[PDB]
């Protein structure tokens, strides 16, 4: 790709780039599942370096790091590393394959004292509900091990918000997404940030498995999150995946969700 | 009766052409004749300038192809060769005209210094495209027109501009091939004709509006055009001969992001025009 | 001059309860909007008028959690969310920009019709809403 | 759409993508029926008449959003 | 003079074409006449076609108006 | 007298384009004239079907004025 942009811009052996420029200009100024964003950007890179270059070639061969990328760029429109942000309250990075490329769902769920039911907001479907209702049904098994009251299904309405309308898989794949969100509102403490999840979840507490484990091991690369949850009937959909696609990733391969939230919910009451 | 007389107002305004046929007289078929050698002309060009005369010999109200032959010949032989506008390859002289178009708006001027600074540094290290050309984006009060006219007087180009948004039919754009009145020699070649210097800044004005009742798509025609190694072989349906424009720079303007063809997004970009402020407008007023 | 073809209108909050001002644009001119909430009590129901979107009502739906996270923090009661008609007054239809950009606005247009209070004059706003009752980054801050 | 470039230099042959995004109808994967001057075939005979081989590579890019809003 | 002189030309063209060998006729339009002849055929069928067959002689290939009888 | 001299006038246009170009579509917009106002309907029924054959002064190609006036 830079070979193809410094030939654009007839940068013959005039500028060069460093692998943290490159990394800089990948998690910090494009976040797409394919490599169409980097082609424009060092493109743009390209264009600024012949504008600096034609007032005055001063330096022999100019070494682009990742210091000097926002002079020929500016901002960065995306945070560096998602490890940065915050642990939040009511937040769960899901998984999803978007056809317009992998990007995590931030499921938001408040729960707010009163009646009691489910409020369903951010266009659900049906399967959403049912996996809201799993997820329910099995903390209701377990409460006094999460700090919540025996009586919250009581009393208690939920909103969640889903983004990007419907369901953009075209059927649940964020059954532990939800069961840590809703796990976390009812509770009231930050959820984890830095790790994406992704499963089935089923009324007695199991994580049933998922499809196509490639895109949601992806889906986490591009957008930047570095640890994966993923359901441990896909322990031998790890033994099939080119290596590349298993850099940088400690994925906990999960069967109850007794452990999911063992990782989130750091501080349980 | 009002048949008869809505023909004999057509015959008569037929009859009434006296300038036309006055250069039909003298200057078709024996000036234009002399021409070919009087001015510098390629071989291909000044032989099929020949069989354009042999097209002639008969009158130009006539037969419509006669009529569309004539109008070739007068569109070739008015294109001369070697000459050039020159060069600045001095980006800081172009910001200094720059600076008082309104201001140089402080964002649209580095844009295109990035579009010039690769414009002089390609493949052969000279005008030639193998890139988008970045049509101008924002509302259509703004000053698009000013930004055109302060590149070109930096760059010394002899500035022009055609009719291309809001059309819908193709003679204007394209034409179609030398068979039939109402195919005319496209814009293009009108500003050609304009000026004999091959590197002219051909302005296409209000891209995102180009359409017509001809079906044939002519996104066909822009892709021909925008790309060097087409552009320099850039026919249409009138083109009949591919027409030499090799060192022709182009430049666009449009002001919505949506009406626009898909195959007018490679070899095409973005440029974003910020609309002006009432401070904006207060200081360009008093100033200018 | 002659008869002013504009206003110093559009400059103006209009300080009554309920009434707030949506910053939106277009990418051939400029303008703004502006909206009124009703609170009728009623069944508590959001009645839409002005052909609106869903995602004006996800945001009201969001506004009222909000509300209903932290009545004691506006002197509300808890139950009151259930009897409260929101009628809701905007000259546009749909929001130009994508999903909600006017929010904060629309929030606490919402709190307003809830808090017999009116809008501040000559403070505009713009920007997104979260459920958790966090204001996301609105893109194009340029044009807003 | 690189890869389909990618098999052709591996088979020698051309490499011609039709974007079908922004289709509706059958009057642009088929031709309206010819009638008048002015109109088209559909897509793919334009495809082939770019290449100049009966042996190409074409990628009918963006198949998903070939919709049918309209009679036919 | 000249139009009314082009107008007995264009005359002199369309009088000698109905007599250039008829190559319209018969070969790219009798071809479907026999067909209808020569098919084990309802009764009614064969006259609905020769009432379309009689809507013919009227240049479909610069009207639409008639392509459809052709397709039919 | 002039009730019936529209309908002469009308009847008149319909047997002259029957010496005309293509015999009046083989003398067609007469049946489905005569299989309405033969075949005894209501006056006010015979009326509107008048005006709403009148409406085949238009295209019919594909636009939903002729269509669906020859359906009607």
Same mark, same amino acid.
């Given at each position: 790709?830079?070979?193809?942009?410094?030939? !654009?811009?007839?940068?013959?052996?005039?500028?060069?780039?460093?692998?943290?420029?490159?990394?800089?200009?990948?998690?910090?100024?494009?976040? !797409?599942?394919?490599?169409?964003?980097?082609?424009?950007?060092?493109?743009?890179?390209?264009?600024?370096?012949?504008?600096?270059?034609?007032?005055?070639?001063?330096?022999?061969?100019?070494?682009?790091?990742?210091?000097?990328?926002?002079?020929?760029?500016?901002?960065?429109?995306?945070?560096?590393?998602?490890? !940065?942000?915050?642990?939040?309250?009511?937040?769960?990075?899901?998984?999803?394959?978007?056809?317009?490329?992998?990007?995590?769902?931030? &499921?938001?769920?408040?729960?707010?004292?009163?009646?009691?039911?489910?409020?369903?907001?951010?266009?659900?479907?049906?399967?959403?509900?049912?996996?809201?209702? $799993?997820?329910?049904?099995?903390?209701? $098994?377990?409460?006094?091990?999460?700090?919540?009251?025996?009586?919250?299904?009581?009393?208690?309405?939920?909103?969640?918000?889903?983004?990007?309308?419907?369901?953009?898989?075209?059927?649940?794949?964020?059954?532990?997404?939800?069961?840590?969100?809703?796990?976390?509102?009812?509770?009231?403490?930050?959820?984890?940030?830095?790790?994406?999840?992704?499963?089935?979840?089923?009324?007695?507490?199991?994580?049933?498995?998922?499809?196509?484990?490639?895109?949601?091991?992806?889906?986490?690369?591009?957008?930047? &999150?570095?640890? &994966?949850?993923?359901?441990?009937?896909? %322990?031998?959909?790890? %033994?099939?995946?080119?290596?590349?696609?298993?850099?940088?990733? %400690?994925?906990?391969?999960?069967?109850?969700?007794? %452990?999911?939230?063992?990782?989130?919910?750091?501080?349980?009451? | 009766?009002?048949?008869?007389?809505?023909?004999?107002?057509?015959?008569?305004?037929?009859?009434?052409?006296?300038?036309?046929?006055?250069?039909?007289?003298? +200057?078709?078929?024996?000036?234009?004749?002399?021409?070919?050698?009087?001015?510098?002309?390629?071989?291909?060009?000044?032989?099929?300038?020949?069989?354009?005369?042999?097209?002639?010999?008969?009158?130009?109200?006539?037969?419509?192809?006669?009529?569309?032959?004539?109008?070739?010949?007068?569109?070739?032989?008015?294109?001369?060769?070697?000459?050039?506008?020159?060069?600045?390859?001095?980006?800081?002289?172009?910001?200094?005209?720059?600076?008082?178009?309104?201001?140089?708006?402080?964002?649209?001027?580095?844009?295109?210094?990035?579009?010039?600074?690769?414009?002089?540094?390609?493949?052969?290290?000279?005008?030639?495209?193998?890139?988008?050309?970045?049509?101008?984006?924002?509302?259509?009060?703004?000053?698009?027109?000013?930004?055109?006219?302060?590149?070109?007087? +930096?760059?010394?180009?002899?500035?022009?501009? *055609?009719?291309?948004?809001?059309?819908?039919?193709?003679?204007? *754009?394209?034409?179609?091939?030398?068979?039939?009145?109402?195919?005319?020699?496209?814009?293009?070649?009108?500003?050609?004709?304009?000026?004999?210097?091959?590197?002219?800044? @051909?302005?296409?004005?209000?891209?995102?509006?180009?359409?017509?009742?001809?079906?044939?798509?002519?996104? +066909?025609?822009?892709?021909?055009?925008?790309?060097?190694?087409?552009?320099?072989?850039?026919?249409?349906?009138?083109?009949?001969?591919?027409?030499?424009? +090799?060192?022709?720079?182009? *430049?666009?303007?449009?002001?919505?992001?949506?009406? @626009?063809?898909?195959?007018?997004?490679?070899?095409?970009?973005?440029?974003?025009?910020?609309?002006?402020?009432?401070?904006?407008?207060?200081?360009?007023?008093?100033?200018?």
């Amino acid at each position: 790709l830079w070979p193809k942009q410094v030939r !654009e811009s007839g940068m013959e052996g005039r500028i060069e780039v460093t692998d943290a420029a490159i990394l800089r200009v990948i998690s910090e100024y494009t976040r !797409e599942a394919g490599v169409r964003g980097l082609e424009r950007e060092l493109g743009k890179i390209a264009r600024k370096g012949a504008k600096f270059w034609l007032e005055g070639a001063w330096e022999g061969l100019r070494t682009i790091d990742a210091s000097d990328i926002p002079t020929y760029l500016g901002i960065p429109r995306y945070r560096p590393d998602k490890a !940065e942000t915050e642990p939040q309250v009511g937040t769960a990075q899901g998984l999803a394959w978007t056809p317009v490329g992998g990007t995590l769902l931030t &499921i938001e769920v408040a729960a707010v004292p009163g009646s009691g039911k489910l409020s369903l907001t951010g266009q659900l479907g049906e399967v959403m509900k049912e996996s809201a209702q $799993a997820a329910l049904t099995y903390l209701r $098994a377990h409460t006094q091990d999460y700090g919540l009251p025996e009586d919250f299904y009581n009393k208690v309405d939920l909103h969640v918000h889903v983004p990007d309308g419907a369901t953009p898989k075209d059927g649940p794949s964020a059954g532990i997404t939800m069961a840590t969100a809703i796990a976390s509102a009812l509770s009231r403490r930050p959820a984890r940030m830095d790790i994406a999840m992704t499963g089935e979840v089923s009324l007695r507490g199991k994580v049933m498995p998922i499809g196509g484990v490639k895109e949601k091991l992806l889906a986490a690369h591009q957008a930047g &999150i570095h640890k &994966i949850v993923l359901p441990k009937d896909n %322990e031998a959909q790890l %033994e099939e995946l080119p290596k590349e696609v298993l850099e940088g990733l %400690e994925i906990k391969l999960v069967e109850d969700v007794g %452990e999911v939230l063992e990782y989130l919910l750091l501080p349980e009451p | 009766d009002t048949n008869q007389r809505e023909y004999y107002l057509r015959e008569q305004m037929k009859a009434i052409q006296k300038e036309l046929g006055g250069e039909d007289g003298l +200057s078709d078929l024996e000036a234009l004749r002399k021409k070919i050698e009087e001015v510098g002309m390629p071989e291909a060009v000044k032989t099929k300038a020949l069989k354009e005369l042999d097209r002639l010999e008969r009158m130009q109200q006539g037969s419509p192809e006669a009529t569309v032959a004539r109008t070739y010949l007068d569109w070739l032989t008015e294109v001369p060769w070697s000459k050039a506008d020159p060069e600045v390859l001095d980006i800081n002289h172009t910001r200094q005209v720059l600076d008082e178009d309104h201001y140089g708006l402080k964002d649209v001027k580095e844009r295109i210094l990035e579009y010039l600074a690769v414009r002089q540094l390609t493949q052969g290290l000279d005008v030639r495209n193998k890139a988008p050309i970045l049509v101008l984006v924002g509302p259509p009060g703004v000053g698009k027109t000013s930004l055109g006219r302060s590149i070109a007087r +930096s760059m010394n180009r002899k500035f022009h501009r *055609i009719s291309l948004g809001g059309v819908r039919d193709e003679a204007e *754009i394209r034409g179609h091939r030398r068979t039939y009145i109402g195919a005319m020699p496209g814009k293009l070649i009108h500003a050609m004709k304009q000026v004999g210097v091959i590197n002219p800044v @051909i302005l296409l004005d209000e891209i995102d509006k180009m359409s017509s009742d001809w079906r044939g798509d002519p996104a +066909s025609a822009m892709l021909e055009v925008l790309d060097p190694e087409q552009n320099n072989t850039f026919t249409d349906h009138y083109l009949d001969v591919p027409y030499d424009l +090799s060192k022709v720079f182009f *430049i666009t303007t449009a002001n919505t992001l949506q009406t @626009i063809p898909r195959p007018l997004l490679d070899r095409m970009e973005v440029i974003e025009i910020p609309g002006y402020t009432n401070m904006e407008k207060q200081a360009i007023a008093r100033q200018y």
